[PDB]
Write a protein that holds these residues in place. Structure first.
Motif, short mmCIF file in Angstrom:
data_model
loop_
_atom_site.label_atom_id
_atom_site.label_comp_id
_atom_site.label_asym_id
_atom_site.label_seq_id
_atom_site.Cartn_x
_atom_site.Cartn_y
_atom_site.Cartn_z
N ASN A 76 -10.80 -6.61 9.20
CA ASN A 76 -9.91 -7.46 8.43
C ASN A 76 -10.05 -7.13 6.95
O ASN A 76 -11.16 -6.88 6.47
N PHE A 77 -8.93 -7.12 6.24
CA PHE A 77 -8.90 -6.84 4.82
C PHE A 77 -8.29 -8.02 4.07
O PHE A 77 -7.40 -8.71 4.59
N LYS A 78 -8.78 -8.26 2.86
CA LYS A 78 -8.27 -9.30 1.99
C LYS A 78 -7.75 -8.69 0.70
O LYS A 78 -8.38 -7.79 0.12
N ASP A 79 -6.59 -9.16 0.25
CA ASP A 79 -5.98 -8.69 -0.99
C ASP A 79 -6.74 -9.27 -2.18
O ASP A 79 -6.70 -10.49 -2.41
N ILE A 80 -7.43 -8.42 -2.94
CA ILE A 80 -8.19 -8.89 -4.09
C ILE A 80 -7.65 -8.25 -5.37
O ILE A 80 -8.39 -8.07 -6.34
N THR A 81 -6.36 -7.92 -5.37
CA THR A 81 -5.74 -7.30 -6.53
C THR A 81 -5.86 -8.17 -7.77
O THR A 81 -6.01 -7.66 -8.89
N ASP A 82 -5.81 -9.50 -7.60
CA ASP A 82 -5.90 -10.40 -8.74
C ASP A 82 -7.23 -10.28 -9.49
O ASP A 82 -7.30 -10.64 -10.66
N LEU A 83 -8.28 -9.76 -8.83
CA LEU A 83 -9.57 -9.61 -9.50
C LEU A 83 -9.55 -8.52 -10.57
O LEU A 83 -10.42 -8.52 -11.44
N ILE A 84 -8.59 -7.60 -10.52
CA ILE A 84 -8.41 -6.60 -11.57
C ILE A 84 -7.09 -6.80 -12.30
O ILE A 84 -6.66 -5.90 -13.04
N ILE A 103 -15.67 -2.34 2.69
CA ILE A 103 -14.75 -1.23 2.46
C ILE A 103 -13.76 -1.64 1.39
O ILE A 103 -13.22 -2.75 1.44
N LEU A 104 -13.52 -0.76 0.42
CA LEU A 104 -12.48 -0.94 -0.58
C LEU A 104 -11.37 0.05 -0.33
O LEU A 104 -11.63 1.24 -0.08
N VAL A 105 -10.13 -0.43 -0.36
CA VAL A 105 -8.95 0.41 -0.22
C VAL A 105 -8.11 0.22 -1.47
O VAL A 105 -7.76 -0.91 -1.82
N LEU A 106 -7.80 1.32 -2.16
CA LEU A 106 -7.14 1.29 -3.45
C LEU A 106 -5.86 2.11 -3.41
O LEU A 106 -5.82 3.21 -2.84
N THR A 107 -4.80 1.57 -4.02
CA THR A 107 -3.54 2.29 -4.16
C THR A 107 -2.98 2.01 -5.55
O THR A 107 -3.25 0.97 -6.15
N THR A 108 -2.20 2.97 -6.06
CA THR A 108 -1.61 2.85 -7.38
C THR A 108 -0.16 3.31 -7.31
O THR A 108 0.19 4.16 -6.49
N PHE A 109 0.67 2.74 -8.18
CA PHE A 109 2.09 3.04 -8.15
C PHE A 109 2.73 2.67 -9.48
O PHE A 109 2.16 1.94 -10.29
N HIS A 110 3.94 3.20 -9.68
CA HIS A 110 4.72 2.96 -10.88
C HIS A 110 5.45 1.63 -10.79
O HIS A 110 5.87 1.21 -9.71
N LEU A 157 0.83 -1.20 0.00
CA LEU A 157 0.00 0.00 0.00
C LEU A 157 0.87 1.26 0.00
O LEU A 157 0.85 2.07 0.93
N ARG A 158 1.66 1.41 -1.06
CA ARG A 158 2.61 2.50 -1.20
C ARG A 158 2.06 3.62 -2.09
O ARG A 158 1.90 3.44 -3.30
N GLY A 159 1.77 4.76 -1.48
CA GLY A 159 1.30 5.94 -2.18
C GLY A 159 -0.14 6.33 -1.88
O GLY A 159 -0.71 5.99 -0.84
N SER A 160 -0.70 7.11 -2.80
CA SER A 160 -2.11 7.50 -2.84
C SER A 160 -3.05 6.36 -2.48
O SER A 160 -3.07 5.31 -3.13
N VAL A 161 -3.84 6.56 -1.43
CA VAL A 161 -4.76 5.56 -0.91
C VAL A 161 -6.18 6.12 -0.99
O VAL A 161 -6.47 7.16 -0.40
N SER A 162 -7.04 5.43 -1.73
CA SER A 162 -8.45 5.77 -1.84
C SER A 162 -9.26 4.75 -1.05
O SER A 162 -9.02 3.54 -1.17
N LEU A 163 -10.22 5.23 -0.26
CA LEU A 163 -11.08 4.37 0.55
C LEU A 163 -12.53 4.67 0.22
O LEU A 163 -12.94 5.84 0.21
N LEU A 223 -5.51 -3.56 -4.47
CA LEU A 223 -6.89 -3.36 -4.06
C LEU A 223 -7.23 -4.33 -2.94
O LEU A 223 -7.10 -5.54 -3.11
N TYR A 224 -7.66 -3.78 -1.81
CA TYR A 224 -8.01 -4.56 -0.63
C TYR A 224 -9.50 -4.42 -0.35
O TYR A 224 -10.11 -3.39 -0.67
N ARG A 225 -10.07 -5.45 0.26
CA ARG A 225 -11.50 -5.49 0.53
C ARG A 225 -11.75 -5.99 1.95
O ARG A 225 -11.20 -7.01 2.35
#
Ligand SMILES: *[C@@H]1O[C@H](CO)[C@@H](O[C@@H]2O[C@H](CO)[C@@H](O[C@@H]3O[C@H](CO)[C@@H](O)[C@H](O)[C@@H]3O)[C@H](O)[C@H]2NC(C)=O)[C@H](O)[C@H]1NC(C)=O
Ligand SMILES: *[C@@H]1O[C@H](CO)[C@@H](O[C@@H]2O[C@H](CO)[C@@H](O)[C@H](O)[C@H]2NC(C)=O)[C@H](O)[C@H]1NC(C)=O
Ligand SMILES: CNC(=O)c1c(O)nnn1CCC(C)C
Ligand SMILES: *[C@@H]1O[C@H](CO)[C@@H](O)[C@H](O)[C@H]1NC(C)=O
Length: 662
Positions: A67-75, A38-45, A22-28, A58-60
């Motif tokens: 508790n949050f689960k890594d669902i980055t593979d869904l996108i 809750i969705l937590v989103l971050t983007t990076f180079h 979760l490095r950088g800009s975090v959107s919730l 992307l965490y859910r």
């Protein structure tokens, strides 16, 4: 704080989640009500050509952030453009749309869309590139609209699976009610070049058919049940407001001043009864005038002068106090260039200073040490980098509660502010806490929580079960965090709160959240015995009309301060109205009339000047005939006085000064 064994009841309800990456800009974003999603989103180079040099994470959560689960593979780790944000569906649609970045040479854009609260995502390639975020039709979450980079208006009826371009050359598009779309179009040049010459259009069948409801349009806006449109004046570069309550079938000119290009209009607040309209003053002033409309949005009373509304940043302190009917707070610029907080209790009928706390002394801004007011820090104080972590907080389900940083004196002061609280909608105030804090209301006011705003890391949380009178402190972690913000479910009905921050530098300052559940603190459910009768807007019980606001009083049941119990997610605010007899104060002056320093009576204006004369000459004849009075919008008084005068025509009066042709 009289809670017993509170540490033991919170220690096992405190859930830490450390985000390793979760490095950088975090959107919730919260997804729905009563879901805890809750969705937590971050983007990076990334240095990967195959990813177009970007990836997301992307965490859910589905337990309110415990508790949050890594669902980055869904996108598929695809980089998501955060300027668009997460497009969250209405109420409990569970719709989620993420806007991906695509590589060069793509036909159109790409979105990842979920219709099941982000449990599953599907990828959709668009026939266009989105320019704006995708907007859900409020009536139907399957209907979406978006502008393309070519200024094409695209609509989807199947939650973005398939899109159709319903019109080209569109400047601005907005959903109305009943799946209606309003939008402006340009002709010869760009949207800026064709200002004052745009056309305003409507479609009620998602682009099957169209109707032109306005020409010579500058811009438009929606507020409550009103459609506003600004139209040019043919001879020059100025514009004025026209209003429609029938989605543009018929229009009337608003009784508001015209403005130039370097001025602006701003809808401060609007509902089914009326609108609060701000009109910027001519010149580089940083202030304007608040006008309140009648129920038609046509006739306007001047409500407040020198209302602060800066051009740089568009900062205004206007705040609907949502915890009490008719209460609004804002900032005004005195002639002295000082800023004063004003409060209205009757929907802008009259404004006054806020009463200072009884035990508070005045600061250096007040000439008199014992005579001063309370002033409130809002958006403008925050924009000026004062040490104000949050703006005022109110929730409609927490009756009467208002929480804000402020200062006691004759003007908003620059010193580090304390937190003040009102339990009666702003009539009386007490110092809630010393120094700045972040605050949140849970369980419709059953619990108030506060986090100290400090430069150093913190590990304590303050809570109160008696509406901010008594407080207790709970150490929620042994590793202090640099606090960044609170997260709690919108609507202030949960008992879960999420404390967000990053750990100290020696721990690589990863993001971490501590979600605390107060269910063992408020173990007992509230009963009838825990509620008490409370008349809102009470100032003198010996007065027969005590509490009458816009023609009626409201008597509430509200939770006793001494009662330590949970209102519950299904809690319903209980209130009963008393219908007061009408007085003259329940009426506003209609067009062509005004009120002198003498109380109550609306008298005929001697001469109509400025915009008043422009309304008379060009306004609709129906509005030009009146007796001088109109019931205040939202006023429910019955009986008593009713205006005796019949319907006099005011247009003969204005035209009588002009020589008329045959
Ligand atoms: C200032 O804030 C208050 C509180 O948020 C606003 O009052 C709220 O206004 C909305 C819209 O008019 C009301 O929603 C409506 O509720 C009825 C239920 O009777 C429903 O049938 C409608 O479809 C609509 O959803 C809401 O109930 C009301 N809240 C309270 C506590 O009265 C007020 O409008 C704001 N002021 C301005 C000028 O916008
Ligand atoms: C505090 O958070 C918990 C989540 O840990 C919420 O628990 C949910 O409660 C509803 C209603 O009882 C249940 O239907 C859900 O199954 C619960 N979720 C889980 C994951 O167990 C709880 O509702 C929150 N408190 C409040 C007042 O909203
Ligand atoms: C933010 N204010 C504006 O977008 C604006 C302006 O300054 N003139 N017309 N509009 C459109 C708003 C409608 C009330 C006409
Ligand atoms: C992700 O990649 C898989 C495998 O290539 C593909 O089938 C799928 O459509 C992609 N998108 C989503 C949203 O899974």
């Amino acid at each position: 704080g009289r809670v017993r064994d509170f540490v033991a009841k919170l220690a096992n309800n405190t859930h830490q989640h450390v985000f390793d990456d979760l490095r950088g800009s975090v959107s919730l974003s919260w997804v729905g009500d009563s879901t805890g999603v809750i969705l937590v989103l971050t983007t990076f180079h990334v240095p990967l050509v195959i990813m177009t040099f970007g990836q997301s994470k992307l965490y859910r959560s589905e337990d309110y952030g415990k508790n949050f689960k890594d669902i980055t593979d869904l996108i598929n780790n695809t980089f998501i453009r955060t300027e668009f944000g997460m497009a969250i569906g209405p109420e409990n649609s569970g719709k989620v749309v993420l806007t991906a970045e695509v590589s060069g040479g793509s036909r159109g854009g790409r979105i990842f869309r979920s219709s099941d609260f982000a449990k599953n995502f599907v990828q959709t390639d668009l026939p266009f590139h989105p320019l704006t975020q995708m907007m859900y039709s409020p009536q139907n979450s399957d209907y979406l609209l978006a502008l393309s980079t070519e200024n094409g208006l695209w609509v989807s009826k199947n939650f973005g699976g398939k899109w159709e371009e319903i019109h080209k050359a569109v400047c601005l598009a907005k959903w109305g009610s009943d799946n209606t779309i309003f939008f402006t179009t340009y002709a010869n040049g760009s949207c800026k070049a064709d200002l004052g010459a745009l056309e305003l259009w409507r479609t009620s069948d998602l682009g099957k058919s169209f109707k032109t409801i306005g020409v010579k349009i500058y811009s438009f806006g929606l507020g409550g049940r009103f459609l506003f449109a600004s139209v040019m004046a043919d001879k020059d570069t100025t514009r004025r407001i026209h209003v429609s309550t029938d989605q543009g079938d018929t229009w009337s000119m608003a009784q508001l001043p015209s403005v130039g290009q370097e001025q602006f209009y701003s809808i401060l607040a609007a509902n089914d009864d009326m609108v609060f309209m701000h009109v910027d003053e001519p010149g580089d002033t940083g202030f304007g005038t608040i006008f309140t409309s009648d129920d038609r949005g046509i006739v306007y009373s001047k409500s407040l002068d020198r209302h602060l509304y800066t051009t740089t940043g568009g900062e205004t302190d206007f705040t609907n106090v949502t915890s009490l009917r008719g209460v609004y707070i804002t900032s005004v610029l005195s002639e002295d260039n000082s800023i004063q907080t004003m409060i209205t209790f009757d929907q802008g009928g009259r404004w006054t200073h806020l009463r200072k706390p009884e035990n508070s002394e005045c600061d250096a801004t007040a000439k008199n040490k014992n005579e001063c007011s309370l002033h409130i820090h809002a958006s403008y104080s925050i924009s000026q980098k004062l040490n104000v972590p949050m703006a005022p907080l109110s929730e409609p389900n927490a009756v009467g509660i208002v929480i804000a940083h402020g200062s006691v004196g004759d003007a908003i002061s620059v010193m580090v502010p304390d937190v003040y609280i009102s339990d009666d909608g702003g009539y009386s105030w007490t110092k809630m806490l010393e120094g700045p804090h972040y605050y949140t209301i849970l369980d419709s006011g059953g619990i108030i929580v506060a986090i100290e705003h400090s430069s150093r890391p913190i590990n304590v949380i303050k809570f109160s079960t008696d509406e901010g009178q008594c407080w207790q402190t709970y150490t929620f972690t042994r590793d202090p965090i640099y606090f960044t913000g609170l997260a709690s479910e919108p609507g202030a009905r949960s008992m879960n709160i999420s404390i967000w921050g990053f750990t100290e530098s020696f721990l690589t300052s990863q993001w971490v959240s501590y979600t605390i559940d107060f269910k063992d603190i408020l173990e007992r459910n509230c009963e009838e015995k825990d509620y008490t009768i409370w008349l809102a807007h009470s100032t003198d019980p010996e007065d027969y009309e005590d509490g009458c606001i816009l023609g009626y009083k409201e008597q509430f049941l509200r939770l006793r301060k001494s009662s330590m119990c949970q209102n519950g997610r299904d809690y319903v605010v209980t209130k009963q109205p008393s219908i007061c007899l009408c007085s003259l104060e329940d009426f506003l002056c209609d067009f062509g009339y005004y009120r002198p320093e003498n109380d109550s009576k609306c008298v005929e204006q001697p001469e109509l000047k400025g915009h008043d004369l422009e309304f008379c000459l060009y306004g609709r004849e129906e509005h030009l005939t009146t007796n001088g009075y109109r019931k205040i919008p939202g006023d429910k008084c019955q009986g008593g006085v009713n205006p005796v005068r019949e319907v006099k025509d005011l247009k003969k009066k204005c035209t009588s000064n002009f020589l008329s042709p045959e």
